TrEMBL record, chain C:
The lineage of its organism: Eukaryota, Sar, Alveolata, Apicomplexa, Aconoidasida. Pfam families: Ribosomal_L29e. This is 60S ribosomal protein L29. Belongs to the eukaryotic ribosomal protein eL29 family. Residues 1-30 have a biased composition (Basic residues). Residues 1-35 are annotated as: Disordered. Keywords: Ribonucleoprotein, Ribosomal protein.
TrEMBL record, chain D:
Belongs to the universal ribosomal protein uL15 family. Residues 1-13, 20-37 have a biased composition (Basic residues). Residues 71-144 form the Large ribosomal subunit protein uL15/eL18 domain. The lineage of its organism: Eukaryota, Sar, Alveolata, Apicomplexa, Aconoidasida. It comes from Plasmodium falciparum (isolate 3D7). This is 60S ribosomal protein L27a, putative. It holds the Pfam family Ribosomal_L27A. Residues 1-37 are annotated as: Disordered. PANTHER family: 60S RIBOSOMAL PROTEIN L27A, LARGE RIBOSOMAL SUBUNIT PROTEIN UL15. InterPro entries: Ribosomal_uL15, Ribosomal_uL15/eL18, Ribosomal_uL15/eL18_sf, Ribosomal_uL15_CS. One of its GO terms (biological process) is translation. GO terms for molecular function: structural constituent of ribosome.
From TrEMBL, chain E:
The chain holds residues 2 to 54 of 215 of the full protein. This is 60S ribosomal protein L13. The lineage of its organism: Eukaryota, Sar, Alveolata, Apicomplexa, Aconoidasida. It comes from the Eukaryota. It comes from Plasmodium falciparum (isolate 3D7). Belongs to the eukaryotic ribosomal protein eL13 family.
From TrEMBL, chain F:
One of its GO terms (cellular component) is cytosolic large ribosomal subunit. Belongs to the universal ribosomal protein uL4 family. This is Large ribosomal subunit protein uL4. GO terms for molecular function: RNA binding; structural constituent of ribosome. The chain holds residues 53 to 309 of 411 of the full protein. It comes from Plasmodium falciparum (isolate 3D7). GO terms for biological process: translation.
Length: 125, 186, 66, 147, 53, 257
RNA sequence: GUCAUCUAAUUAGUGACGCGCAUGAAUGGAUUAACGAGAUUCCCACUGUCCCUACUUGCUAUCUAGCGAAACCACAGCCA
RNA sequence: UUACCGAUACCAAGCCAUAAAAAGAAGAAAAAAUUUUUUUUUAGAAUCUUUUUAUGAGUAGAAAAUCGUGGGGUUUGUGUUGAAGCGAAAUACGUGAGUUUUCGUGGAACAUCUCCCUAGUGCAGAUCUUGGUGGAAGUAGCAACUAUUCAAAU
RNA sequence: AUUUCACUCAUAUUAAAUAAAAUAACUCCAAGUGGGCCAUUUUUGGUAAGCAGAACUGGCGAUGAGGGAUGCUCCUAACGC
RNA sequence: CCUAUUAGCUGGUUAUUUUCGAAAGAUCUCUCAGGAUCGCUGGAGUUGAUUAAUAUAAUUUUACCAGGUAGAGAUAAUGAU
RNA sequence: AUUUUAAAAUUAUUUGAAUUUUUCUUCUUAUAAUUUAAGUUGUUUCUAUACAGUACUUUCUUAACCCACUCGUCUUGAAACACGGACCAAGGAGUCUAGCAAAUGUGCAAGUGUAUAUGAUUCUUUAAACAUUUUACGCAUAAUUAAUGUAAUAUGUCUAUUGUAGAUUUGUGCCCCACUUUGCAUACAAUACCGGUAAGCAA
RNA sequence: UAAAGCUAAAUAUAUGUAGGAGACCGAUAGCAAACAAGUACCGUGAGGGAAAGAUGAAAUAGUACUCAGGAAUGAGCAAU
């Protein structure tokens, strides 16, 4: 069903799974459109693995923003934080996975004094 | 369910945006469709449309045809979206005021010596934004060789389509179906 | 095996999918093989008309250009 | 530019765009120009009318150097020489240009076009069309035959 | 054959991969020839290596 | 290219109908692991690739001489403007002017120390630092193919005479030189990028005009070559829009639905 | 096929008959003692072939210690 | 004769996309404290921005835009304060291929989406190839050659 | 018959009506296809056939949804969330 | 080994969304499991329309045409009876 | 941030008129406010006077109601008593070259391409880049004929064939259209002229 | 100017040897063979023909000692 928090409405949860991936190990759950001929899912038989459509698209006014109602931006050092100084209340910052504890403390403190929220603030400590 | 042609969506044909990634041509297109939108000028609308066209639809125009088309009105400006090429068959030029996308080196020199001048489309927008005293011209679009193969297939009755052959000797596609002596002709 | 020899089924639908095209109906038809000794005379008429018209226009041009 | 190829966009489509019923067999109509006059006859007659048969006599060894002759038409002689020299031959009625067309690389002078009225011009060439001669003499020039 | 195309004419009905060869060494050969003739004219002690024709 | 017969150097046999096995060719014999295994075929292990790479691929390309000359001219022009050189990646915020030219004695210096000192004194200390600290071992299998490091591109020193400049400015990472007579597009636009920080000697700068048509000389000027002409006289599109002649032509601003 | 015989009963066997679909003479015809792991019918003897099955012996099966595969396998396994 | 139930069809409204359209190359608003402070914004990317309406099945087939992989130029980055990879995950984003993060493991490299170049570039099947592993199953079976037993030593 | 001059034949609703009529017309390149089948109505052969062969239109194929308990083709109705 | 011979025949032919969307007729064919060629389809592009018109229409009206199926007939012809 | 304006309605005054004759009668005259205009705003509680729980968000696992036949494939028709598939990993199939065309982008343009090769203080890269003493060759610039061959208005004019539509331009009734003016592209024709063939003449 | 003869260069080199490179492959790939590879092994023979790389910086740190076991091994308060 639809999920609605604040103004952000997510039109569908529980991401689509590939047909028959439940009962075949070689078939990964990642969605693939089934070509088939008599394919059930392709023909849209009721009660079987509905396919993604453009109609599920979230509205463009609130498309990419996180539950904190702002867009995420992934940074790798303190230098890539400069553009956030202007839109600190529209963007949250996430530190890249391959950033060391050297630099993570620096990015955390810089974002703190920049007044921009950090997503994975308590990582690697 | 509703019964509409094309499921109710209007379909247009032809170019929508310029394919050329030429920065100067992109600037020209921006300026001229701004002019077309803002002014009422069908002149500007046509220029904006023609700046968008493929290369085969902005063919070169010779100085001979330029002079011939501008013969009756001598004080106006010939605006051609293609390029202007020099015609060696022409003996003498006379005082031509022409705006064009590109000018051949020879055509340019001939025009300057004749005393006219070569104009670009930004200058044309600067001086004649609406298009007063500007005659819109274009070269022969159907004159190119590729068009000689189009139309009815070569082999249809009364077809003037030029076939695709290696060469055009007597022994190349000239015997059966091209003369009464061998079965039929065309 | 036996083949379905013939059917006109779906042919009308195919025909009407791009409509029943009408002939273009141009204004002038070529006179290549029609009424000789008449269209030849028409050629002579037209030649004379152009001769007289062009000679009048040339007279006017000469008398206006001195 | 293998990433722009159309086959890439049929990557998961089974038939690779070649049909489910007809399939993509290998040479299902024959090889090369096989079926002419038999089952590709409609193609041959519609796009290459006079293909089959032979006409004319045989030239055993040709030696195209014997009959090679480029042609220049009568309306390009004045354009052969530069513009200021056109001007200088134009205003002066006592001199005419002598153009050795053979030297520029044409052997025959053809008669299409229009020479300038009352502008004499002498042309040297190996061959002349009769109408080319008539036009050159009409403008007061002369055709000189050279080899 | 199909559609309006020139009739095919390719003379590749024999084993042509054996005879294919590509000149990867055109400019290398140019340099080698220039070096050889330069060494020739250096060896013959000021006499030009060209002959009058 | 792969070895010509690779994967097909075995005895061919596909006895496979009625054997309850796939009809793929199998190697003959017995007494070894390979006997009976799937023979050549792109799907088989050790079977040879689908379309073996051949040396007669179209490696090179033929480029029109006029187009190459146009590209070189455009690269020089692009190097002549500050914004493009800045956007390319160079740190030229302390340069006095983008088409910077230095006295011909730059062609005579012969020590990398004084070359670096001159480069710094021009204000390219940041550029030199970028080039120096950019040296880095690259990612991937390239570094096992004699392609270990990856450097950025710095200033291109264009000179007319070599009195030591070539053996003075090399060995500085990211710096390359070019004689003005043989200037190369592969150096002028590295990676197809627009605008390269170019440092000209005075003589090379002056000889550019000789090369490209002005003050013609017999064995220097590119014979009967004409500099390309723009299709617009002035690309200041919004200036010509704000000109009062066309402002009077524009009618009243309308409104959306 | 018809007539005899064989039986109680004979699409079988044997002896005859012959306008023989379509027999026949070294494409060999007719007949033949002896011979045959050749085809066929009948009789005597014989017997679990059978009426009509029963009991019994060895080796397995079976349970255990040890050892220990394979074919087959879309997913699986009640019916009207 | 009434009432009711009953669709992915119909109607009203929202949102996605497609198509078409109308139009466009610069200035302060509010709130909370107390005249002065504080907090949000204060926009202008033309394949763009704002707004409007209609429409949305689809095999064979075609096209566009996207998402990934090996390698190459350009740019600018990440790594012993632990890279790639891998297992489980996530108040995560996307419609979706995917992307990005956390923890654990790992112990030496990795990315570049700034733009572009390149290809041996994307698997569920082909009695596909190679390798590994199952249920069958502690099952079938370990049945020719008459036969073993007592005591002792090691 | 052609050409040139004249005069003028509704158009303010448009030389009858109606028309999400320009979503048109044309040109180029090219894919797939070229085994079909069913329903109503008509019809040939056949005793007849879920038979063989045809005509019109609509469908199934290529297509799900509600109903006909069940059902490729029936009725309703065709599909973004 | 030529040889990865040939196969009009069987099997397979690898990411997502969006948009458009078929044919199983026809002509010729040593053709009937194939092909070429029309038709149907996509993409590209131009000319047009953008002016509640004109072009246009699987529609009707008005005017005018052509027909010999259903029906009717056997005393109208032929053939029956 | 120059239409959530204007008006429309309502209220309170005000001007005149009308009329169904008046406590919602109507029409304007002005003013000022409202919303019934000009797509939801307010109040009060709780979350809660917390820093992560028994609440809230989310994943997973289980149920429950309704629904749901193995996919791939050939086929008119497959869940089929049609074939392939025991399972998993890795590999696995429209590519390369020649030649032609169309399309589009780019450069130059009656020219275009510098082929082979040469030179040159270039020689890690560099097997690439750079260059080419003012009728080499390809394609195009002219066609037609088996062919000897012949070869495109025609010197009255440096005008440049003729029509009907037609883009653009010019004026008269800077924002409509009707008349003029010009007449691109293109379409449909007509004319000339070139090559070949007929026919007539033919030193 | 045939029926006699010689002759360098420009030319070619899927061989051998030796160098140098690469937008090549990265152990099911790349040669069949990264290794003791035309080896093991198979066939009377002509011939057929594999699989198989990685401790760690250093084994000049490759597991000492104790306990339990016949031993393999296991465990440790012991150990690189």
């Amino acid at each position: 069903a639809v999920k609605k928090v604040g103004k952000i409405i997510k039109k569908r949860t529980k991401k689509f799974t590939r047909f028959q991936s439940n009962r075949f190990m070689r078939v990964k759950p990642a969605w693939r459109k089934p070509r088939g001929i008599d394919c059930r899912v392709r023909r849209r038989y009721k009660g079987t693995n509905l396919m993604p459509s453009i109609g599920y698209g979230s509205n463009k006014k609130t498309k990419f923003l996180l539950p904190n109602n702002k867009y995420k931006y992934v940074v790798k050092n303190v230098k890539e934080m400069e553009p956030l100084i202007m839109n600190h209340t529209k963007y949250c910052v996430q530190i890249a996975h391959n950033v060391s504890s050297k630099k993570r403390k620096q990015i955390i403190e810089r974002a703190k004094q920049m007044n921009v929220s950090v997503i994975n603030a308590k990582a690697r400590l | 369910g509703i019964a509409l042609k094309n499921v109710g969506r209007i379909k247009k044909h032809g170019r929508k945006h310029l394919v050329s990634k030429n920065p100067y041509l992109r600037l020209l297109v921006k300026l001229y469709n701004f002019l077309a939108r803002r002014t009422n000028a069908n002149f500007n609308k046509i220029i904006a449309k023609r700046l968008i066209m493929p290369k085969r639809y902005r063919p070169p125009l010779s100085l001979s045809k330029l002079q011939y088309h501008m013969a009756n009105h001598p004080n106006d400006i010939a605006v051609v979206v293609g390029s202007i090429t020099d015609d060696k068959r022409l003996f003498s030029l006379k005082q031509l005021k022409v705006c064009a996308l590109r000018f051949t080196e020879t055509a340019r020199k001939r025009i300057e010596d004749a005393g006219g001048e070569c104009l670009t489309f930004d200058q044309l927008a600067l001086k004649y934004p609406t298009g007063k005293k500007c005659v819109l011209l274009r070269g022969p679009t159907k004159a190119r060789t590729a068009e000689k193969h189009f139309g009815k297939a070569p082999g249809k009755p009364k077809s003037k389509a030029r076939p695709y052959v290696r060469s055009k000797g007597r022994k190349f596609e000239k015997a059966r179906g091209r003369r009464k002596s061998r079965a039929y002709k065309k | 095996a036996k083949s379905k020899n013939h059917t006109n089924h779906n042919q009308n639908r195919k025909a009407h999918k791009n409509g029943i095209k009408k002939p273009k109906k141009h204004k002038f038809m070529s006179r290549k093989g029609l009424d000789p000794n008449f269209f030849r005379n028409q050629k002579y008429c037209l030649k004379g008309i152009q001769k007289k018209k062009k000679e009048l226009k040339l007279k006017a041009k000469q008398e206006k250009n001195n | 530019a293998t990433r722009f190829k159309k086959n890439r966009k049929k990557r998961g489509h089974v038939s690779a765009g070649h049909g489910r019923v007809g399939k993509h067999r290998k040479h299902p109509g024959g090889r090369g120009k096989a079926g002419g006059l038999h089952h590709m006859r409609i193609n041959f007659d519609k796009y290459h009318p006079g293909y089959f048969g032979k006409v004319g006599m045989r030239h055993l060894n040709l030696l195209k150097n014997r009959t090679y002759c480029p042609t220049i038409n009568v309306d390009k002689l004045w354009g052969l020489l530069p513009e200021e020299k056109k001007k200088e031959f134009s205003e002066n009625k006592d001199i005419a240009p002598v153009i050795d067309v053979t030297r520029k690389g044409y052997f025959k002078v053809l008669g299409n076009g229009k020479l300038k009225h009352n502008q004499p011009i002498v042309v040297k060439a190996r061959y002349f069309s009769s109408v080319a001669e008539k036009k050159i003499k009409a403008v007061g020039g002369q055709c000189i035959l050279v080899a | 054959v199909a559609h309006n195309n020139v009739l095919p004419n390719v003379h590749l009905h024999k084993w042509w991969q054996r005879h294919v060869r590509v000149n990867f060494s055109k400019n290398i050969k140019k340099k080698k020839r220039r070096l050889l003739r330069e060494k020739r004219r250096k060896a013959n002690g000021g006499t030009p290596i060209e002959k009058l024709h | 290219a792969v070895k010509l017969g690779a994967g097909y150097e075995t005895s061919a046999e596909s006895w496979g109908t009625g054997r309850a096995v796939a009809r793929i060719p199998r190697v003959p014999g017995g007494g070894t692991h390979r006997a009976g295994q799937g023979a050549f075929g792109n799907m088989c292990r050790g079977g040879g690739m689908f379309n073996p790479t051949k040396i007669w691929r179209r490696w090179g390309r033929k480029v029109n001489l006029k187009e190459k000359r146009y590209a070189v001219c455009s690269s020089i022009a692009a190097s002549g403007v500050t914004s493009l050189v800045l956007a390319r990646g160079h740190r030229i915020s302390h340069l006095k002017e983008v088409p910077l030219v230095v006295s011909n004695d730059i062609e005579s210096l012969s020590k990398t120390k004084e070359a670096v000192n001159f480069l710094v004194s021009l204000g390219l200390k940041d550029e030199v630092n970028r080039l120096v600290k950019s040296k880095k071992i690259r990612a991937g299998k390239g570094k096992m193919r004699n392609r270990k490091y990856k450097i950025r591109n710095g200033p291109l020193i264009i000179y007319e005479n070599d009195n030591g400049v070539k053996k003075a400015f090399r060995n500085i990472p990211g710096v390359d030189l070019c004689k003005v007579t043989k200037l190369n597009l592969l150096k002028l636009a590295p990676g197809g990028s627009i605008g390269r920080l170019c440092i000209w000697s005075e003589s090379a700068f002056k000889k550019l005009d000789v090369i490209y048509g002005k003050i013609h000389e017999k064995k220097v000027t590119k014979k009967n070559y004409i500099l390309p002409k723009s299709i617009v006289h002035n690309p200041d599109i919004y200036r010509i829009i704000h000109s009062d002649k066309v402002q009077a032509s524009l009618l009243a601003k309308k409104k959306p639905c």
